[PDB]
Amino acid sequence: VQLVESGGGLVKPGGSLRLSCAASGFSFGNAWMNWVRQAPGKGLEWVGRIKSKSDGGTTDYAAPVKDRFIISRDDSKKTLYLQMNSLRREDTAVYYCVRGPFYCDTCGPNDYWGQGTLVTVS
Amino acid sequence: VQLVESGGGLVKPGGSLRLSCAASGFSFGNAWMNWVRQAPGKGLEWVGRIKSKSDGGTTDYAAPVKDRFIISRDDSKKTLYLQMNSLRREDTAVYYCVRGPFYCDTCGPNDYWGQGTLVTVS
Amino acid sequence: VQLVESGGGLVKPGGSLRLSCAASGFSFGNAWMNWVRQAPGKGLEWVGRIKSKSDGGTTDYAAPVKDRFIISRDDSKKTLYLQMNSLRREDTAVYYCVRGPFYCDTCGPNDYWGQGTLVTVS
Amino acid sequence: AIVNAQPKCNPNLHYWTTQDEGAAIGLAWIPYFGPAAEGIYIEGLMHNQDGLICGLRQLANETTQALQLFLRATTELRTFSILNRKAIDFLLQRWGGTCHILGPDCCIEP
Amino acid sequence: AIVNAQPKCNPNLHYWTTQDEGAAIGLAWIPYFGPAAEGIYIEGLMHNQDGLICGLRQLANETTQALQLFLRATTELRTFSILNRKAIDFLLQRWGGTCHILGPDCCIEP
Amino acid sequence: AIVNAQPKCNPNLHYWTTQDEGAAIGLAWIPYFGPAAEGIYIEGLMHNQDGLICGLRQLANETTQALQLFLRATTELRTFSILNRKAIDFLLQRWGGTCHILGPDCCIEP
Amino acid sequence: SIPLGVIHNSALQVSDVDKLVCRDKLSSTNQLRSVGLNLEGNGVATDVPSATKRWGFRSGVPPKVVNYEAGEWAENCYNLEIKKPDGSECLPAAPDGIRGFPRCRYVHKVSGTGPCAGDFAFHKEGAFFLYDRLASTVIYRGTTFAEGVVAFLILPQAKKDFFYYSTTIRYQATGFGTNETEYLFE
Amino acid sequence: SIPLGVIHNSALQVSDVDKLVCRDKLSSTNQLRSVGLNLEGNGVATDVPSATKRWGFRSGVPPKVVNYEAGEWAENCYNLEIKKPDGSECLPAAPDGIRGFPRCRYVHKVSGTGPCAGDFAFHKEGAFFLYDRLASTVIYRGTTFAEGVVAFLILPQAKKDFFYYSTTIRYQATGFGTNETEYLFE
Amino acid sequence: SIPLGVIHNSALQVSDVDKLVCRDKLSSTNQLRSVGLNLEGNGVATDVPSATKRWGFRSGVPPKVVNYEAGEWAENCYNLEIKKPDGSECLPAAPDGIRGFPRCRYVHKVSGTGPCAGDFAFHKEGAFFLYDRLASTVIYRGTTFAEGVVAFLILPQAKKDFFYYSTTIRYQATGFGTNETEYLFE
Amino acid sequence: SVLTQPPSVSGAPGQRVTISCTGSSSNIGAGYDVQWYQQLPGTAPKVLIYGNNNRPSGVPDRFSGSKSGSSASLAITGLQAEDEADYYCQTYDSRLRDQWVFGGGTKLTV
Amino acid sequence: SVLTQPPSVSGAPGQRVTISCTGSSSNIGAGYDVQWYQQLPGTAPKVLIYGNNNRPSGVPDRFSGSKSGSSASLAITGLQAEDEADYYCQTYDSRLRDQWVFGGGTKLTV
Amino acid sequence: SVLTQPPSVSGAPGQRVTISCTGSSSNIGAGYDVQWYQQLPGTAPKVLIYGNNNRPSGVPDRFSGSKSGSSASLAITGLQAEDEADYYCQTYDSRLRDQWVFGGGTKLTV
Ligand SMILES: *[C@@H]1O[C@H](CO)[C@@H](O[C@@H]2O[C@H](CO)[C@@H](O)[C@H](O)[C@H]2NC(C)=O)[C@H](O)[C@H]1NC(C)=O
Ligand SMILES: *[C@@H]1O[C@H](CO)[C@@H](O[C@@H]2O[C@H](CO)[C@@H](O)[C@H](O)[C@H]2NC(C)=O)[C@H](O)[C@H]1NC(C)=O
Ligand SMILES: *[C@@H]1O[C@H](CO)[C@@H](O[C@@H]2O[C@H](CO)[C@@H](O)[C@H](O)[C@H]2NC(C)=O)[C@H](O)[C@H]1NC(C)=O
């Protein structure tokens, strides 16, 4: 099982960036995918979720980030994407993709989170 | 899941060549294996099939290619082999190995065909 | 499925050595693990076994090797370890780790033994 | 002796059931030729004449408690035998013992 | 009142069944010691004396339709209770009501 | 006519069972509100007065063989219907045939 | 001790078993019936928020099933697709041979998420969930049901006197089975 | 309303239930029997091509099973291993506790491929597929069966009057269950 | 032909069915009972090595289950977790709805390894393994049982006259079910 | 008995198109599944439709199909630039010893 | 409604410590699972406790936890040098449209 | 109680050979499985026969075996050049605290 997230780069305030989280090793098409973030020195926050195709395929967003970020997925490439636009300051953080349902007979630890991509706005 | 087919080379008319299709990633021993071909500029054709050991292990061949080609398999190396002998002209084509039953809960596309091996008789 | 065993080296009589067998590709946490050995020119011998966590986690040892060898495991690194101490002569051999229950629907051969690590006492 | 005590009565009973012995038409009884799962029902309409429907609904209410307590005590997953037990009990009440004629429970008129 | 209307009659009935109460021999009734699944059958041979066999076969034919219509209407996957229902019905026809002596359905001869 | 032939008799019977119809208290009959699986049992204590317990134990012994032979012959995985069959047989012995009064098997006293 | 109701001359009286009053005649098992009646017919609120307040989750109680032979046309049926917020099943799949309720004009299909704090979903008033000729104590996943109750009857000797389109309305829900639950109908 | 047959003095009459003729005596449930009879015994063609024309595939009809206590020795049983041309199962596996028919001299085991255009295989004349004391409406995979029918009897009071090697022949088939079907026996 | 016992005036006689003695009155199915009795109550040895010698493994015999309504408090129950020396299951998992015996003061839980040379474990004296209101011919994995036997009774008309902590002791075993078997209690 | 197909089909972006595959009474109308494959120029076929109606995980719901009589259709609604490819229909002939038969193939252009 | 947590906790090697997570009547006491994550400095969170009680394969049994009222606890007994990390409790708010809520985090020192 | 084996066996190409493994009343005749391993010179053992009769996927059907009394056999028919190897039989001793016991090994030559 691997989650590989990329596309984090230094960005000027007000710009736009795209982050991808490519999954392999598990039934990508049957899982719900979440994006979370952690700013340096502070704790964890949840930014958004996308549901499986079989359960509507809808997305929900947290109130601060709503209307500026768009979450989507492609089950033909096994990729989760977060599109950040109108990137006003206070979004600096390490972003993580979190995968699916916690109820796994044998999944074990280190199979639910990625490594983290740093996004700096400056 | 991978199907790797090799052994295609330029051949003089009347000669003999052997093609192999090595499988990995799935229950090779429980599947039926087919050989198909495509000549340049024309559509698809089916050359032959071999059944699983549990269902007789017999082989069938199409009428033009019957009595000159022999299909077999080795479940100790996970390999499908097609032996082409008495290779009279009109056999030039790209050959593909096609794997098993189409009814898979999670197999998905690109898991039933290989990449293709070019055989030219000249 | 892979079993990779390492740590075999030339040792002076009376010394101590540690052998590891790292497993991947199967449900390590649900299997019983055995250590066996083969001296040059003679046949196979069984040195010891460790049971799964769910079944007590206890270890048993053969009478000649008992009280000088200790078998253990770590399910956080998927590793089996054999600690050989007070290594009096007559322990020279190739050591193998053997994995779990023989009743597998699709495991097949070459999935129950490793390659072998040579331990020489001299 | 049942009086309806529900907030309302839908006085009409538009019902569906299966006829265990239909006057079959040729090959329609043969499973291969017969109707699909969806086509095995018949329907009808009964109204609340004689105040029977409001009675029937109330009866169902009264049954629920006892039925629930029955199912709590059983270990079978699906119970199909309640009507058979009711018939056996009905026979036992009348014919389970010695019949003394002119007794209040012996139902032979000579 | 059954007349055979089949193309042929195999007039002989070579049958097998189980004896629910065999005169067991020591420990043979104990499952651990008893016979395997394959050895629980007994056999016998009846011929078509009294024209009974051709009757019996025809009876089976006549049953099939009704039985099929019964199974269509049930939701149980395996039905084991038909004979119990037949016995209960048999008792009900005779003893389900008030017996008026000299009536055609009251079977007590005084 | 049963004499105990066991090595010992525990003369006391400390039993548990379920009451299929408890005098329920309000909402306790409702599955959502009722007791858990573990709390559905009642208990009691009977002693060996009238020598009944040693009799009862011996009866169980005598039953085992016949019961085993019954289960060998059935194909059902779980049998729930033995008591229903016993009741039907009990009714059949008495009322299964024509009653000739003063006969030894007709139980009407006029 | 379950009320058995005997039909008199166009009337229904629950025959009292302690006494034995023989004028009732039951000559065959064909006279025995089980019938399912809808709670709807008694005037209960049928709106989805009102209906869902009657159901609740509970652990430790094994489910139970009982059959019935005849039923009533329902106006309103329900069909639930509820998952936990991570994505998990809180309703068990229908066992073999449990199909949906045959006749209902409207099927209210509710999808969404909830806490699902219990192994099985029961009816808080002790009624049953009616499926195709099987009544269960619990709700199964993705299977249309009606709320109802079961009665047992001795029918009269005469047979004759006694005994299609559907639409789906979709809802999304969050906080299902909670004090304040959010629905939006599409 | 299923014909119950009562044995008279060495004769079988189907007792008519509308009237009540009491001279029949049924004093115990031991007198009740179910019996399986083979269609073979009526002279039907037993050749494999002839037999297979009586079976056909159909969707939408749930299978049903009924038990029987006593049976007949069969000369011919059948055992099917049929797959779709890609390689798939068109016959469901035998449920728990459905074993093969106990006594048949010949077991015709047919293997091959066919279109299998339907969820279950039924008998076109409405007969049953007989297994070990269970008769089913459908064919199960890899399980020997006989074609037959079931009767119900009241036996007489006297017990006494009323109530091994096998060979396999293998066939390969293509186009099974079609107008022209190809068999070769080995 | 299974002994049905009728309670007389404070006595139990097994009613003989061939004759018909009517003074017994059975007016309702409530008078019918099944009861489970513990072999313990007859003085059999209850020590674990003694008890395990009564059980043995066998292939080819399908298991069977029968229900019972009322039982006896047990002093000793048993709970087995036995595996083959490689690590495999020789006891089948409990089917749906088979729970452990409700009342026993002591639960002897035995863990270890053995040859388990047979598909199912039976009682060598033909008694039953009692679970929660279900008696089985075979032992299930990880489920507490009592050894016992079943009787059937006609109770008297009067209801009134007729009808918690546990501890676990752990054992390790090698060579279970063999002539000499090694136990150590912890 | 070989399946036929039109040489080529065309359609504007955003609309729906259907590709026809016509067989015989031994090929499609005998009850065999029809599969559809999409071969983009330069690469290998990938499974698009299998078992007449099923879609493997990952295929957009823009692709569907159906079977009627002795013919089948593939419907693709919402043409995108990436849909240019050769489509092949496949089925099993029943008079050719259950051997694969392929359609001539149809080229799609946008 | 956001979960709270103590700034930091401490304890001697070999002893037991507990970390508290306190919520509200809409967060934990409404019936939602509480998860615990361990973030070692310099790396990414790994799942430690999921579904209130469950442990994924590979996590030592030193880690457990519980839920009561509107609070939850994580108990770790036998502190080792490697346990220094930031622990976060997580649950689903029911009045915030079933969105994730995180605790402030507690630093552990040995 | 240690298993014995012949030093070496031989046979002509194309014929059948059998390798014997003889144990004791506590080893094989107590009811334990016997496994067979094939060690080609220069490499590691691979599983050939497990659980007395079973073969893992990939092993030719030329290899079989059996158990009787206190002995076991491995039968290999159709010797090929590649069969030269050392074969070992293994079982579990019941008087040695269920510990593995190995046979001495037999060399095969063609
Ligand atoms: C039988 O009818 C009564 C009367 O309508 C039902 O009682 C309601 O009962 C529930 C609890 O079971 C209460 O919450 C309601 O307030 C009651 N309504 C009234 C108007 O008092 C009862 O539910 C019915 N039985 C069943 C099984 O549904
Ligand atoms: C009962 O017997 C009749 C007469 O033999 C069987 O009828 C045949 O019925 C099938 C259709 O069910 C026809 O295709 C045949 O042509 C009939 N044969 C004759 C000679 O007319 C009938 O099948 C039997 N019942 C069952 C259940 O098998
Ligand atoms: C019924 O009681 C008898 C007498 O106690 C039991 O018999 C013992 O039977 C077993 C074999 O079944 C013998 O090994 C014992 O030696 C017998 N004991 C004595 C003292 O003779 C019998 O087991 C009981 N029935 C059941 C089903 O347990």
From TrEMBL, chains D, E, F:
What residue stretch is flagged as signal peptide? none
Q: Which residues form the Envelope glycoprotein GP2-like HR1-HR2 domain?
A: 13-93
Here the disulfide bonds are: C9-C54, C99-C106
Highest taxon of source: Viruses
Q: Where in the cell is it found?
A: Host cell membrane; Secreted; Virion membrane
Q: Which family is it part of? A: Belongs to the filoviruses glycoprotein family.
The entry's function note states: Functions as a decoy for anti-GP1,2 antibodies thereby contributing to viral immune evasion. Interacts and activates host macrophages and dendritic cells inducing up-regulation of cytokine transcription. This effect is mediated throught activation of host TLR4. Acts as a class I viral fusion protein. Under the current model, the protein has at least 3 conformational states: pre-fusion native state, pre-hairpin intermediate state, and post-fusion hairpin state. During viral and target cell membrane fusion, the coiled coil regions (heptad repeats) assume a trimer-of-hairpins structure, positioning the fusion peptide in close proximity to the C-terminal region of the ectodomain. The formation of this structure appears to drive apposition and subsequent fusion of viral and target cell membranes.
Can you state the subunit structure given in the record?
A: Interacts with host entry receptor NPC1.
Under which name does UniProt file this protein? Envelope glycoprotein
Task: Please tell me the species this chain comes from.
Answer: Ebola virus
- Report which part of the complete sequence is shown: 503 to 612 of 676
